[PDB]
């Protein structure tokens, strides 16, 4: 029998997790999920935090989960859990280098597959990538992944606006000269939570095991242009999509800071390839000019080691449609938590797109209540959004989460899903080439 909403008919097998997001799955008690879990992994660190996340989630004060982890450690992980087949639905969240080759065998193994991002790190991978969507499909289960951005409130706002003529006008395309949508992120290596340091795995800056920069958060930034910018239009990878520029970087680490964000004492041995006079060189910097569908976008992503006291990560975006600019900002100004605002392009008739404005905003309102626009310069307006719609990455986590738990039970993701990853991971993958062939 198929999946049908009955309590208990998820049977979770955890592979190999190191990271969070294979614990935040978890975090909280669907009816579907059965509380039994079963967890294949090398014996380590990486588990060891995985369980303790877990057991966590069973020991809070609020509403805690009843979580029965099910553990096996050694060498032969994989080889058990294929062998022992416990459980139907299989969380990877960690070592981005192994995921893909982890990915096709438990799909071949009947087993439906939720993946963090990115499911493919390179252009082998991405081929591999392929079968696996492959073997989903001939096997009527289901292979997805993670965008998370996509329930940011921001996000779905700039979507909105996009789609109404009389606020954005046609999509341009712009040109690699001046792109029509440009999304700039700078992210960080170590933050501190409550005065305790978030640690990450040593292999998180081996670029050979986590990804390069360019592959890795891009996904979420390219997936964004094709969600935001063509909503629900399926692309074609082999027909809409031409790469034009790519380059890749690298941030420096001191020992101490790698000492510092990582645990482990300077250098691991698989890292001394990218040590230079004691200082590790990573390749987590990367930014692609690709046009999809006739239009040109930019992606960029950088990873700084740590932001200076009253700092953290920024986002800048542009998307240019023949009446407006939508722009985020996410800076010191707006205290790094996105703001949205609508540009009117210069020439038009101001007066009469302000009232075009406040008859669509009515429309939006209905969509999101409370949501209005605030004057802040003229032909500059913010999009005002209230405090409840910020419920940040974990519920947005969660929305993932529930709509793939949904999406089981008919078997099958809407149209534009499939073709769409592969799409998204067309772009990263072929981008790490193109920035590899300048070096």
Same mark, same amino acid.
Request: hydrophobic fraction near 35%.
């Given at each position: 029998?198929?999946?049908?909403?009955?309590?208990?008919?998820?049977?979770?097998?955890?592979?190999?997790?190191?990271?969070?997001?294979?614990? @935040?799955?978890?975090?909280?008690?669907?009816?579907?999920?059965?509380?039994?879990?079963?967890?294949?992994?090398?014996?380590?660190?990486?588990?060891?935090?995985?369980?303790? &996340?877990?057991?966590?989630?069973?020991? &809070?004060?609020?509403?805690?989960?009843?979580?029965?982890?099910? *553990?096996?450690?050694?060498?032969?992980?994989?080889?058990?859990?294929?062998?022992?087949?416990?459980?139907?639905?299989?969380?990877?969240?960690?070592?981005?280098?192994?995921? %893909?080759?982890?990915?096709?065998?438990?799909?071949?193994?009947?087993?439906?597959?939720?993946?963090?991002?990115?499911?493919?790190?390179?252009?082998?991978?991405?081929?591999?990538?392929?079968?696996?969507?492959?073997?989903?499909?001939?096997?009527?289960?289901? @292979?997805?992944?993670?965008?998370?951005?996509?329930?940011?409130?921001?996000?779905?706002?700039?979507?909105?606006?996009?789609?109404?003529?009389?606020?954005?006008?046609?999509?341009?395309?712009?040109?690699?000269?001046?792109?029509?949508?440009?999304?700039?992120? *700078?992210?960080?290596?170590?933050?501190?939570?409550?005065?305790?340091?978030?640690?990450?795995?040593?292999?998180?800056?081996?670029?050979?095991?986590?990804?390069?920069?360019? *592959?890795?958060?891009?996904?979420?930034?390219?997936?964004?242009?094709?969600?935001?910018?063509?909503?629900? !239009?399926?692309?074609?990878?082999?027909?809409?999509?031409?790469?034009?520029?790519?380059? &890749?970087?690298?941030?420096?680490?001191?020992?101490?800071?790698?000492?510092?964000?990582?645990?482990?004492?300077?250098?691991?041995?698989?890292?001394?390839?990218?040590?230079?006079?004691?200082?590790?060189?990573?390749?987590?910097?990367?930014?692609?000019?690709?046009?999809?569908?006739?239009?040109?976008?930019?992606?960029?992503?950088?990873?700084?080691?740590?932001?200076?006291?009253?700092?953290?990560?920024?986002?800048?975006?542009?998307?240019?449609?023949?009446?407006?600019?939508?722009?985020?900002?996410?800076?010191?100004?707006?205290?790094? !938590?996105?703001?949205?605002?609508?540009?009117?392009?210069?020439?038009?008739?101001?007066?009469?797109?302000?009232?075009?404005?406040?008859?669509?905003?009515?429309?939006?309102?209905?969509?999101?209540?409370?949501?209005?626009?605030?004057?802040?310069?003229?032909?500059?307006?913010?999009?005002?959004?209230?405090?409840?719609?910020?419920?940040?990455?974990?519920?947005?986590?969660? !929305?993932? %989460?529930?709509?793939?738990?949904?999406?089981?039970?008919?078997?099958?993701?809407?149209?534009?899903?499939?073709?769409?990853?592969?799409?998204?991971?067309?772009?990263?993958?072929?981008?790490?080439?193109?920035?590899?062939?300048?070096?």
């Amino acid at each position: 029998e198929g999946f049908t909403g009955a309590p208990g008919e998820v049977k979770l097998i955890t592979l190999d997790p190191g990271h969070f997001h294979a614990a @935040l799955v978890q975090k909280v008690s669907y009816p579907q999920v059965s509380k039994d879990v079963y967890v294949y992994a090398p014996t380590g660190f990486d588990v060891d935090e995985h369980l303790k &996340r877990i057991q966590g989630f069973n020991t &809070r004060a609020e509403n805690p989960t009843a979580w029965n982890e099910i *553990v096996y450690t050694g060498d032969d992980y994989l080889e058990k859990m294929l062998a022992e087949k416990k459980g139907n639905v299989m969380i990877q969240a960690g070592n981005n280098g192994k995921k %893909t080759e982890y990915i096709k065998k438990t799909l071949e193994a009947g087993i439906n597959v939720l993946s963090d991002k990115p499911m493919a790190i390179n252009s082998q991978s991405f081929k591999l990538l392929e079968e696996c969507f492959a073997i989903a499909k001939q096997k009527n289960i289901m @292979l997805y992944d993670i965008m998370t951005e996509r329930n940011e409130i921001t996000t779905m706002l700039q979507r909105e606006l996009s789609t109404i003529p009389a606020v954005y006008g046609e999509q341009l395309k712009g040109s690699p000269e001046e792109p029509a949508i440009v999304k700039e992120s *700078v992210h960080h290596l170590f933050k501190l939570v409550d005065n305790k340091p978030l640690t990450r795995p040593v292999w998180y800056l081996d670029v050979n095991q986590q990804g390069e920069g360019i *592959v890795d958060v891009t996904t979420h930034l390219v997936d964004l242009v094709q969600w935001e910018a063509f909503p629900d !239009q399926i692309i074609d990878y082999r027909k809409d999509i031409e790469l034009i520029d790519a380059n &890749r970087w690298t941030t420096s680490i001191s020992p101490e800071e790698f000492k510092q964000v990582t645990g482990t004492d300077a250098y691991p041995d698989f890292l001394k390839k990218d040590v230079e006079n004691d200082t590790l060189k990573v390749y987590c910097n990367g930014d692609i000019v690709y046009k999809i569908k006739g239009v040109t976008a930019k992606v960029s992503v950088i990873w700084n080691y740590t932001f200076p006291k009253g700092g953290g990560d920024t986002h800048f975006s542009v998307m240019k449609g023949s009446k407006a600019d939508l722009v985020i900002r996410q800076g010191k100004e707006q205290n790094y !938590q996105p703001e949205l605002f609508v540009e009117a392009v210069k020439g038009v008739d101001l007066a009469a797109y302000e009232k075009d404005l406040t008859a669509s905003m009515e429309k939006v309102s209905a969509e999101y209540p409370g949501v209005a626009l605030n004057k802040v310069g003229d032909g500059v307006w913010q999009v005002e959004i209230p405090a409840k719609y910020r419920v940040g990455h974990e519920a947005h986590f969660g !929305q993932v %989460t529930e709509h793939f738990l949904d999406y089981l039970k008919e078997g099958k993701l809407p149209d534009w899903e499939v073709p769409n990853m592969l799409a998204k991971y067309y772009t990263t993958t072929s981008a790490l080439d193109m920035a590899k062939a300048k070096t």
